[PDB]
C-alpha cells in the first residue's frame, strides 16, 4: 500500500493506497488484476508489457497498470475480482469489462475503441432518479424498487451488477417492472427525505409509498420478490 506509483517494465503498479490518486484525472486506463501465485498471469506478463509499450507511444498516451488483487483487497472488492488475470478498462472513472482474448492485437484495438471521445457504454435498463424526476417516476409506478447508493462504498459493489441484471429481466415482462437508483451522495436532499443512513439502502415503492426492501440481493431473488410483490404470487 505504498503511495508511490512505481513502473515495472512499462507497467504501472497500483494498489489500494494510490489507485484513486492516479486514475482521477485519466480519461482511459487499462487495468490488470493478478495474483502472484497465478501461472496464467505470469505467462501473460510479457504480453501485457508489450501492450503498455504500444499504448505509451500513441498520441496521447494511455496508461497501463497492474494490481495485485491478493494485497489490494479493497480494489479487488470494488471491481468484483474473483479470478485472474482479470482485465478492465476504466473510461472516465467507470469500469468496462474486457472478456476477449489476452492478445496485444485485441486488447490494443478495444482500448483504442473505448478511448474515443464519443464512445459510450451499453445503456442500462435501471432508471436514474434525481430530485427533478424522482416523484414523477415513483408516483406513476404501481411498484418500483429503488436503490440509494454511495459511489464511495466498497462493500456495495459485489451485488451492484446483480441489480442491473435483475432490472434487465424485469423489463422484459408484461407489464414491465422498473428498477431505479439514486446516487445519495449527489442527491443529498432525496437521501435526507428517505432517512438514508447507511448502504446499501433499497426501498420498494407501492403506489408512491416507500417500504424497506428486505428481500435477497442476488439476481434471481430480486426478480422473484418483485414478481411476487407485483401481484403474481404463484410466479
Ligand atoms: Cl398508471
Ligand atoms: Zn399513470
Ligand atoms: Zn416466486
SS3 call for 233: coil
Catalytic residues: 38, 41, 153, 156
Q: According to the entry, how was the structure determined?
A: X-ray
Between the CA of residue 29 and those of 56, 121, 152, 221, what are the distances in Å? Answer: 11, 15, 19, 34
Cα(140)–Cα(131) distance, integer angstroms: 15
Q: How far apart are CA 67 and CA 79, in angstroms?
A: 11
156 and 233 housed in the same domain: yes
Q: How many Cα atoms within 13 Å fall on the side-chain side of residue 190?
A: 24
Picking from 116, 140, 161, the residue at the C-terminal end of a domain is 116
Q: What is the CA angle 85-114-183, rounded to 5?
A: 85
CA 154 to CA 77: how far, in whole Å?
A: 7
Name the residues around ion ligand 2, CB cutoff 5 A.
Answer: 140
Angstrom resolution of this structure: 2.0
Q: How many domains does the chain have?
A: 2
Helices (H), the chain: 19-23, 39-56, 73-78, 104-115, 134-140, 160-171, 188-193, 219-229
The Å distance, Cα 179 to ligand 2 centre, comes to: 17
CA-CA distances (angstroms) from residue 101 to 2, 109, 225? 31, 11, 37
Q: In which domain, by residue range, is 172 found?
A: 117-235
For residue 131, the domain's CATH number is: 3.40.30.10
φ, ψ for residue 20, nearest 5 deg: -60, -40
CA of 230, nearest ligand number: 3
Measured in angstroms, how far is the CA atom of residue 133 from the centroid of ligand 2?
14
Domain final position from 116, 133, 158: 116
Q: How far apart are the first and last CA of the chain?
A: 49
Task: Mark whether 182 and 74 lie in a shared domain.
Answer: no
Distance 96 CA to ligand 1 centre (A): 36
Return the C-alpha cell found at 158. Answer: 459485489
Amino acid at each position: 500500500d505504498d503511495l508511490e506509483v512505481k513502473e515495472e517494465n512499462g507497467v504501472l503498479v497500483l494498489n489500494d493506497a494510490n489507485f484513486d490518486n492516479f486514475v482521477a484525472d485519466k480519461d482511459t486506463v487499462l487495468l490488470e488484476f493478478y495474483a502472484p501465485w497465478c501461472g496464467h498471469c505470469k505467462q501473460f506478463a510479457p504480453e501485457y508489457e508489450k501492450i503498455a509499450n504500444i499504448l505509451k507511444d500513441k498520441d496521447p498516451p494511455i496508461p497501463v497498470a497492474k494490481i495485485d488483487a491478493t494485497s489490494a483487497s479493497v480494489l479487488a472488492s470494488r471491481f468484483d475480482v474473483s479470478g485472474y488475470p482479470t482485465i478492465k478498462i476504466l473510461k472516465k472513472g467507470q469500469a468496462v469489462d474486457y472478456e476477449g482474448s489476452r492478445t496485444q492485437e485485441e486488447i490494443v484495438a478495444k482500448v483504442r475503441e473505448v478511448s474515443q471521445p464519443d464512445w459510450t457504454p451499453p445503456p442500462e435498463v435501471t432508471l436514474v432518479l434525481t430530485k427533478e424526476n424522482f416523484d414523477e417516476v415513483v408516483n406513476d409506478a404501481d411498484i418500483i424498487l429503488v436503490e440509494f447508493y454511495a459511489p464511495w462504498c466498497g462493500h456495495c459493489k459485489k451485488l451492484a451488477p446483480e441489480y442491473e441484471k435483475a432490472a434487465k429481466e424485469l423489463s422484459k415482462r408484461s407489464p414491465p417492472i422498473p428498477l431505479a437508483k439514486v446516487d445519495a451522495t449527489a442527491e443529498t436532499d432525496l437521501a435526507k427525505r428517505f432517512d438514508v443512513s447507511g448502504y446499501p439502502t433499497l426501498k420498494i415503492f407501492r403506489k408512491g409509498r416507500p417500504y424497506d426492501y428486505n428481500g435477497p440481493r442476488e439476481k434471481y431473488g430480486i426478480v422473484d420478490y418483485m414478481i411476487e410483490q407485483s401481484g403474481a404470487a404463484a410466479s
